[PDB]
Structures are given as structure tokens and as C-alpha cells.
Ligand binder design. Structure first.
Ligand SMILES: [Zn+2]
Ligand SMILES: [Zn+2]
Lengths: 397, 397
């Protein structure tokens, strides 16, 4: 099954589960941060998401739903707290059969080694869109620089402590933004996440389970890895959000768009089948190109031509498409998790609330979260109720 | 894949896809009706569901949502019409990857050869709860009587032409009703279905796609075959309905009940694993008892003990449970089918409407139903809209 490594923020680097990585956007800049492999293909970096920000952004400019605090995640203590909370959360997601399924799908959706603008016959790992640099420590004593591939890298929140988000690596090709996670190739996905500040709802009020907030963002991660991240298809919200929530809100996206998206992804995949059909080599010699042809064939659910050409099989594609866009949603995951969800995606999300002690097994555990049955809090989701589980949360301001 | 046989109501009997069967409730009564194997384990019998009715019931007693008409499905013509409409409907369900999945799951969920009250160490086919008698025609010329197992038998509507329904075979053991389709063993499931009279909704009004009405009932059939048909668990509707609809309405069932149901099915399965673990023989010699141990092991997702004893594996059971109760719902099927669904299960279901020509490819086809894109009726589900597709429906009274 899936293993969720353990580690204290003080643990030394080991070139395996604990390293010093230069995040994808800091490529060539030689700026490293300690990171942790929570599990295969997924890393955690206890640092605020600063990319594309300026310190002026990192505090409440004068001019609740937009809470700030520039000191959050700045000391080693905060970081080890952040690190531990994330581990419990992943373990919480892994211990439910439906959570294990999601992580499994995300771990295997490795980004294709290339994109719409890379040599068609060659697998390419030389791109921050697919690989990040790290600092290794030779057995000799020397400290060298190398690189590895990954699917997901999770950070702490950006300026807005309560605004979780998932962005794919943007490549600047021919003076314009290109998204390998919308072309079907997939790319490293990055997450800005804050486990502590959860939203509340009423459509008696409830506060949300942070673990569900994580799976929600993970679903965006899933769409990305398969390269089908619905762009800023605003309509006035992006279809990407609706698909992720689920239930009837998903049907707010017109057949016309859904069909246009489906047809577009299909084209993207036919193109990738063709491309994969010419890869004969790879810049990086430490790569079994034949092993990847196999992995990628399972990823996109392709078949081999009488002559060997990889081809898209409509039926298999449709099953995979439904799986990627419908198989995992906040409504169904909330359902399969004994977790309360807000009525509709458009349901108000009142002032966030802070959960100070998710590390306290008496408040939140990795098998029932807040709804601990032994505290008769499983029933009616009372563990999430604000009038009942009064001690598990504190107000913002 | 799945084959959906074809046949005209006039076609002769062949002891294969067209026979003369004594329905399960007419067992020993020697009353036969022509039936048709639309596909493996599923039969269609163009006859009104009369079991437990009296002619007085079969017409509008004086004293729209309860329409009647005792002459419906009485002539060979009506029956061949009913027969053809059902074939198109099944083909319609089979041509969508999500429809093929449902039928596949239903065809393989064969009722366990036995129940809570049959010899534990022996597979038993001698029960109308698992088998029906038919009339065969020897190559000699003689006409003999025999029997075969089946999962589903679909009839025409009962007294209420617009009230579709799915009941499992009730066994009378020790002067009380026993339901092998609630104990986890499963049993032949029977359907009373009317393809012509569909409901309408608004929460501009729409009429429903009969093929979706069929899958809805099929979902009840699915629950039954796996023996987990939520009883008359009224709360004030039966949880069985809510699970079948889906979306947020599914969450109207309290954790307490859902948990009680889950725990109960788990017990039922542990018990079946134990029972299957002692079957050494079978009354019916034309049965590879070892072949069935294999099929049943896949059905209930069991594993073999170091010593060989079949055992329930919590995780595999949970995946199978979610699959059976969440994997197929009206909301998700409607979604994956370009079909309009009513907002919530509690959404009003106005006077039914009659679709006179489902056999007219210009009105309904086996790939897009009413929402034919060539007639620019795919978009916005206009094919289901009442103001737009005016010719595809006629009012009741
Ligand atoms: Zn989101
Ligand atoms: Zn129903």
C-alpha cells in the first residue's frame, strides 16, 4: 500500500526523504529549502508560498475572509508543527479506502517527460516543469547538486493564510504562458496550503475538516497531473471549481463547455499518443525509456497498434475521463468520510476559524478527524458543529 | 463486451433467448409466459405485473400521478412494441461507458445459491428465490419442464402504469417474510416497468429520459443482487430511495443509520464467507460447485485463509460497499449521460407525460436519447425541454 513517512523538522538530511531542494521556480537561482517526502512523488516544504509576492503583500493592508499574519511558519517550531499536522492529515486521508484511492491515482499520474514544445522523439527531464534541483551529500563528504522528478510539492500559505490553492508550473515559451497541465502532459503541481484556518458554513453553523480541504486541493492536483486542468474558464466561476466540488453544482457547467472540454482533452491525448510513439531516447541516461513508455501507456490508457503506434481507445479514454473529472469530488469524498460538506459550492463561507490543536488526539485523530465516536462526536457530525465542539476552534478576530 | 440480443415478439421459442417461463411466483402453478433474454442473466416478459393484484386493482377506481389503463400490454402488438422499446433502452444504456459498467456489475452479481435458511454446506437451486421453471422443447419433439437461474426479470407495469418498481423474491419461512436480498445473499429481482410514461420536473419544466428511469430501477436491482436492499427503513422515505438518487439527498440519511446499515451488511457478509466455506455439494449436479466458489469469492470480494476458510477483508469490503451504495446513482448517471435530472429527490414530479414514439430514431436514439445533437437538441438538454421538444410528448388527461 501507500507509506506515509514520518520525520521531525530537526531530523538531518538523508538524500532520500529529507533533502535541501531548490523549488521549481527558484531554478538556477541556487536557493534551497528543507523539504520532506511525505510519500512517493509528493513533497512538503514548511515555508510560506512566496513566488510572485512581495513582503508588502504578506500582511493586512488597510483598505473575515482574508486573514493575514506574516510571522506564521517562520520559526523552526512553527515549521515542525506544520510538518506534523500535514503528516497526520495525509495519514487521515490514507486510512479511508476512498482516501487511499485518491493518493494512489495522484502518485501514479507522473508528469509526461516533455510537453507541446519539447523534442517529440525525446523524453526531457531538463525542465522545472517536471523536475527540481536539490543538494545532495556524497559519501565522500562533498555536497553536490542534482535533480529529481516529482508530481506534487506542498507549501505553507501565501499572504492570505486562509486561501488554499493549486497552481501548475507555467513555462514561458515564445513570450507567452504555456501550461503543460492543460495540454494533457501534466506537470509538477504546487500547493499553497494552511491546515489551521478552515472555513465555516450553514447552508446551525459548522467548521470544515482540514483533511477534506486538503483532498479538495488534491483533486485539483489530480486534474493537473493528467494535464486536464480546466483553465480560467470563468462563467461567474471557473468550471474547474465546480467539477471539484461536485453534486448538482457540477451540472451548472453547460453541456456545450463540458463537450468542448472533453473534445479538447481527447485531442490532447491523441497527440500525446503520437508523441509517445516516437520517443527513442532521453537526455537523462538514468532513465529506462522503455519503462516510461509502459508507465505512460497505463497513465493515458492507450493501446498498441498492429504496427506498434500508441493509440487512444475512445471507450478507455471515457472511463478515464469520468474517473478524472467525476471520480473524486468534495461532495463524494465528504460523503465517504463521515465529513460534513456545505450544501452547494455557492454556499456562503463565513469567517474562517482556527483549529489550534489538530495534533491533540482528543480533538482530531487520523481515523475520524473531529467526529470521534468515542466522544459521541461521530454522530450527526457533531464534531464539526460549532455549538457542540466549542473547544476545538477559536475565532479569527 | 455485453451483447444485447434482438428478437421480434413473434419469433419462435428456441430454448436459448426465447422461452416459455413460469415466473418465480407462479412456481408449481404451471402458468407460462413467453420471455426474452435481453442479455445474460436478464429477462424481459411483456406482461403486466399481476402478482398480488386483482382485476379490480387494474383500472382507475373513482375516489395526475396515478394514471391507469388495463388494456395496456394486452395484445401481441403492444407486447412487441414493449419488447422493442426495451431493447433500444438497454442498447441506450450499454452504449455509454458508464451504462456498460452498471450492466456489467448487475450481470455478475448472481444470487448466492442459498440463504440464511438453507443447508449451510450445500448450494441450493431449488428455490423460486434463485431459479424459475421454463418449458423446453426436446429435439425429439417432446416438451419438457426445466429450470434456470437468473438475476433479473423485467415485467410491464402493474395497475399503475406510471409507477416503476423493484422487488426481491420474498420467501415464506416459519410463517414470516424473509428477504434473501437484504441478508446479503441476493435473489432474483423483479421489475415492474413502463417505458412510455415518464415524469416531469422543474426544480421551465422537463420530461424525463425513460432510459434513466430504467437505470434508476436497475440501481435498486444492483443493491438487491448484492443482498443489501435497504428495507422499509422509512425516515419520511426509505433510505433505499435516497441512496439511489444520490447527490446531497444521500446525506439526508443520518450517520447513525448509515453506520448501522454498513455494520449489518458487514455481518451478513462475514456470515456468508463462513457459509461459502462449507459448501461441499449441490442438489443440482449440473453445477461446478468449485466454479461457483470462485464466482462468489469475486462477488463478495473475499480472501482465502491460511487453512482455506473464506474471510472478509475490511478494506476490500469497504471499496465494494461504496461501489454498491455510491458507485451508481441517478444523479451521477444522469450526469455521465448528458441527461437532465431533477434538483433533489424531493423535487416535485408533476403529472406524467407519454412518449408515443421512442422507436422513432428522429425522436429518440440509442446514443443520445432525446438530446440528439444533430437536431441541436443535445445542448442545454433541450431534447428534454417541454417548450422545445413539443412533438416528442403528449399529455396524460
Ligand atoms: Zn478549489
Ligand atoms: Zn426508486
Amino acid at each position: 500500500p501507500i507509506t506515509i513517512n514520518n520525520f521531525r523538522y530537526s531530523d538531518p538530511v538523508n538524500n532520500d526523504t529529507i533533502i535541501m531542494m531548490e523549488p521549481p521556480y527558484c531554478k538556477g537561482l541556487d536557493i534551497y529549502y528543507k523539504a520532506f517526502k511525505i510519500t512517493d512523488r509528493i513533497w512538503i516544504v514548511p515555508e510560506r508560498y512566496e513566488f510572485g509576492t512581495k513582503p508588502e503583500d504578506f500582511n493586512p493592508p488597510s483598505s473575515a475572509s482574508e486573514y493575514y499574519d506574516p510571522n506564521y511558519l517562520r520559526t523552526d517550531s512553527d515549521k515542525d508543527r506544520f510538518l506534523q499536522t500535514m503528516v497526520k492529515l495525509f495519514n487521515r486521508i490514507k486510512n479511508n479506502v476512498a482516501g487511499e484511492a485518491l493518493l494512489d491515482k495522484i502518485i501514479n499520474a507522473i508528469p509526461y517527460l516533455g510537453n507541446s514544445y519539447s523534442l517529440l522523439d525525446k523524453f526531457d527531464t531538463n525542465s522545472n516543469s517536471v523536475s527540481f534541483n536539490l543538494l545532495e551529500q556524497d559519501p565522500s563528504g562533498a555536497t553536490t547538486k542534482s535533480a529529481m522528478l516529482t508530481n506534487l510539492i506542498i507549501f505553507g500559505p501565501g499572504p492570505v493564510l486562509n486561501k488554499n490553492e493549486v497552481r501548475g508550473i507555467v513555462l514561458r515559451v515564445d513570450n507567452k504562458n504555456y501550461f503543460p497541465c492543460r495540454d494533457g502532459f501534466g506537470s509538477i503541481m504546487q500547493m499553497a496550503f494552511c491546515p489551521e484556518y478552515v472555513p465555516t458554513f450553514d447552508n446551525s453553523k459548522y467548521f470544515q475538516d482540514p483533511a477534506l480541504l486538503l483532498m479538495h486541493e488534491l483533486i485539483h492536483v489530480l486534474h493537473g497531473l493528467y494535464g486536464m486542468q480546466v483553465s480560467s474558464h470563468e462563467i461567474p466561476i471557473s468550471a474547474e471549481e465546480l467539477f471539484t466540488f461536485g453534486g448538482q453544482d457540477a451540472n451548472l457547467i453547460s453541456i456545450d463547455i463540458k463537450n468542448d472540454l472533453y473534445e479538447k482533452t481527447l485531442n490532447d491525448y491523441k497527440a500525446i499518443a503520437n508523441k509517445l510513439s516516437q520517443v527513442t531516447s532521453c537526455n537523462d541516461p538514468n532513465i529506462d525509456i522503455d519503462s516510461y513508455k509502459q508507465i505512460y501507456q497505463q497513465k493515458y490508457q492507450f493501446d498498441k497498434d498492429s504496427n506498434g503506434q500508441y493509440i487512444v481507445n475512445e471507450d478507455k479514454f471515457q472511463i478515464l475521463y469520468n474517473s478524472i473529472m467525476y471520480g473524486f469530488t468534495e461532495i463524494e469524498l465528504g460523503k465517504k468520510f463521515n465529513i460534513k460538506t456545505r450544501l452547494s459550492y455557492f454556499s456562503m463561507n463565513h469567517d474562517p476559524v482556527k483549529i489550534p490543536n489538530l495534533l491533540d488526539d482528543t480533538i482530531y485523530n487520523d481515523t475520524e478527524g473531529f467526529n470521534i465516536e468515542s466522544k459521541d462526536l461521530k454522530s450527526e457530525y457533531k464534531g464539526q458543529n460549532m455549538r457542540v465542539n466549542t473547544n476545538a476552534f477559536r475565532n479569527v478576530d
